[PDB]
Every structure is written in C-alpha cells, then in structure tokens.
Amino acid sequence: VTTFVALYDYESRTETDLSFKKGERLQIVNNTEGDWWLAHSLTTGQTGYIPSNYVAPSDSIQAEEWYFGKITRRESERLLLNPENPRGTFLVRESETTKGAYCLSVSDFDNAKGLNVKHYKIRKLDSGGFYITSRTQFSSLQQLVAYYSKHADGLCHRLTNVCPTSKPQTQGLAKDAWEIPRESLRLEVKLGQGCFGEVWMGTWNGTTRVAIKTLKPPEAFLQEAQVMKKLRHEKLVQLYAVVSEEPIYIVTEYMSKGSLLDFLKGEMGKYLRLPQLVDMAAQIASGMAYVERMNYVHRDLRAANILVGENLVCKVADFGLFPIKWTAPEAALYGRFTIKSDVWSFGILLTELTTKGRVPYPGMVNREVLDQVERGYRMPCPPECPESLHDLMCQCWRKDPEERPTFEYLQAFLEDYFTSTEPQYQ
C-alpha cells in the first residue's frame, strides 16, 4: 500500500537517483510533497531518488493509462490531435471549468471538419455515481470507459485507443542541483549568438540533454534567477541550474524545434494553418498569463524569445531580464516596463505569427517606428490574417496601457477563437 507505479520510463543522471521503466512498481515510504522521493524498485531491487511527478499509487485512478488527471482541455486536444491517432483515441481528465466534474476527450474525423476533439463531460454524482448521460451511470470511471470502449451510445465514436504521451519534464535536474559546477556542462552544438551571449546544446552529467546560455562578459542577477527559479509553468521554459563563476552559465530545458521565429521562417512555417498559429499564440498567452498573475514581467517578448517543441508546443523563454519595434511607447520613452508593455509586445508577436515570421513594420527603420507609433500609427491587418485577430492586436496596441487586455483575457479569447459559438462539452 506504499507501492507507486512509473507512469513513464526514466533514465538516471546521478549516482543517487535511479532509472525505472514505465510500469515498474516502486516502494516509497515518505511521499511528502516534494519533487524528488527516495524510492526502491520492487522490480530491480534498486534504490535512489526519483521525480515525484513520474509515478502514481498503483491502486489509484492516476495509475490509469488513460487518466490524464488535471490536463488542460487544450493540451488534451494537442495530444489528441496527433495524426497517428485513430478516431476514438481518448483520455479522461478533470474538467478545469465545472470543478469536481470529470471529462472524456475523444478524437474524431469528418471531411467537413477534419481532425477534431469532442469533450464529453462526466458528472461525478455526489452520491458516487458517474455519467456522461443520466440514462447511463456507473460506479467508476474505469467502468464507464470500459462500457464506451464497446459502446458508442451517442458518443462520436467508441472508446478505442488510449491517448499516448511522451515523458514529461522532471522539475529540476536532480534532487538538489541548482548552482552546478561548470565542469558538468558539455557544450556540443551552438544554435545562437547575440549581444549578450550564446546558446549551446550541452549535456549535464554526461547523459542529460540541457541548454546552456553563456552570457560572456553580473552577480546581482543570481538573486533574480532565484525568483525565476520558482516560476513554474508548462508554457514557461524551465530553468534548471545556474553558475556563479564567470562567465555565468544558464542551463535550461531543451526545445527540439528551436525558436518560434526560425521555426516560422523555415520549411514548416508554410504548412502551418491558422488554427495552428492561433494555438501557438494561445500557449504563449497562457505562459504569459502565468507570468502575469505571478506579478512578473517578461520585458522582451517576441517570436525570437519563444521556443518550440514536438507537437507544436511553444514556451516563453528569457522571462525576467534595443527591440524598439516590439517595445510599447511608454517603455521606450519612460522605461516603464510592465505587464501591459508586455501585452503590447504580444500584439506585435501576433504579426510575426500571422506573417510567416515577417519583421514588424516591414519598411520602417528602428528610429522611424517609435515616431510613427507616437503619432498613432499601427500596423495594418496582415494578408489573410482574420480581421478579428487584428482587432485583438489593436487592443494590445492601445496608447494607454490600462486600456490593453490581460494575458488572461488574451488566453481565454485565443483558446475559444474558433469554437466561440459552440458548447464547451457535447
């Protein structure tokens, strides 16, 4: 009754932690809130720390290969939207809206709609009962799923394939790692170079694929990397460790696809449809909606400071610590850098997003822009970019910061852009 189960396959990166394959039964006595727990594999007889978020009690709903827990409706769609997923690919999660309730997200396919995802809410009747419909109830989510894996009963499709999912991100590199030794990082590929440093694709402890931001020739930054250490969100690139000795290094989560900009201009940004870029914009607003309620400020939001992953996952990087074209007037003429100037910047990012990577104000020069904008100038609606998306941009470009939307609004607006006149759940 202390047995946990591995949700995904994990590989060691230290002498103190331990590798384990998805499914293995681990033994953990003190499962107090924490990121790393000392566990014992009943399978291997091995002992070592493990990322807490990679296991779930064996006799639990979370141990269900099809229960994604508190996965957001959008990330569930992202996952469920994988082309290599037959109709009926599903997952079960907690409905983040009508709290207490549960949700069954199922993938479909119809030419007049293409790949889509139907969200059937399951009402966990207080009295225990469970149902997607009243005329049909069960005692466990495991049974409902069982039943619908053999019966459509109205559902768009019969529950078939359990929605896949790659391994998540451990929180941190190791149990206590943070200000690691420069001797552990093995830079092996350069993918950047700015006026503040470069960004390599290194390796930590030989096995770990990280990302090192070398800021070749301060110390008063460390005190800030601490607050940047706490900010934990899915749409925010994770900062693993930082080095004191100069030059100062910054190890961070590695994004296979690279920056959103390049990704846009490359040989992929073309086949990128509108619901794609809007999704990509929704992720970014989510991350910034977090940076927002955390009372923080990015100070330099743009498609260059955004990294992309596998299934069009986009994450905000560099948050915290020139780019006039992205800077809100007040920030450039008063140094007033707030979450509102950040919103301004976000509207500019919407133009790169909707213009395959095109530069904001294609025709003006740095100095020009600041002045054009002061007189009230604003970019026009890009080619084939909905006029409704431009209206959203214009709201971000309002003169008065207190007249620009919250990222919470931007996210909400962006997540429901296409399904505005449809019901949340079937």
Curated annotation (Swiss-Prot):
Domain SH3: 1-60
Protein kinase domain boundaries: 185-418
Entry keyword set: ATP-binding, Cell adhesion, Cell cycle, Cell junction, Cell membrane, Cytoplasm, Cytoskeleton, Endosome, Immunity, Kinase, Lipoprotein, Membrane, Mitochondrion, Mitochondrion inner membrane, Myristate, Nucleotide-binding, Nucleus, Phosphoprotein, Proto-oncogene, S-nitrosylation, SH2 domain, SH3 domain, Transferase, Tyrosine-protein kinase
Membrane topology: Lipid-anchor; Peripheral membrane protein
GO molecular function, one term: heme binding
Main localisation: membrane
E.C. code: 2.7.10.2
Localization per record: Cell membrane; Mitochondrion inner membrane; Endosome membrane; Nucleus
Family under the similarity heading: Belongs to the protein kinase superfamily. Tyr protein kinase family. SRC subfamily.
Name of the protein in its database record: Proto-oncogene tyrosine-protein kinase Src
Species this protein is from: Gallus gallus (Chicken)
Residues of the full protein shown: 83 to 528 of 533
